[PDB]
From a paper:
Mammalian defensins of 2 to 5 kDa in size are rich in Arg and/or Lys residues with three intramolecular disulfide bonds and are classified into α, β, and θ subfamilies according to their disulfide topology and sites of expression. Cryptdins are initially synthesized as inactive precursors, i.e., procryptdins, which are proteolytically processed to their active mature forms by matrix metalloproteinase 7 (MMP-7 or matrilysin).
Crp14 adopts a disulfide-stabilized, three-stranded β-sheet core structure and forms a noncanonical dimer stabilized by asymmetrical interactions between the two β1 strands in parallel. Arg9 and Glu17 form a salt bridge that is conserved in all mammalian α-defensins. Crp14 dimerization is mediated primarily by interactions between the two β1 strands in parallel, in contrast to the dimers of other known α-defensins that dimerize via the interactions of the two β2 strands in antiparallel. Four asymmetric main chain-main chain H-bonds form the basis of the dimer interface, i.e., Leu4a O-Leu4b N, Cys6a N-Leu4b O, Cys6a O-Cys6b N, and Cys8a N-Cys6b O. In addition, Asp3b N donates an H-bond to Asp3a Oδ1 and the side chain of Tyr7 packs against neighboring disulfide bonds in both copies. As shown in the dimeric structure of Crp14, the two side chains of Thr10 directly point toward each other, 8.3 Å apart between Thr10 Oγ1 atoms, such that a T10K variation may be energetically unfavorable for cryptdin dimerization due to electrostatic repulsion.
Residue numbers in the entry:
A (entry chain A), B (entry chain B): 3 to 35
Amino acid sequence: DLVCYCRTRGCKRRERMNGTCRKGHLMHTLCCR
Amino acid sequence: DLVCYCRTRGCKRRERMNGTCRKGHLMHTLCCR
């Protein structure tokens, strides 16, 4: 599987940008490793 | 697949803590579903 973080800015080291996600009905980055 | 949010107020009822995370140099719950 995949562990993904829904982040307010960009993705961390070694994380993949796996499209976007929503938090508080606002666009965020889906960062997965 | 797991999607995790670093939440200022804590985890939704359908989420579960999964350790902590940092946000604005402050410690918060990491909440995943």
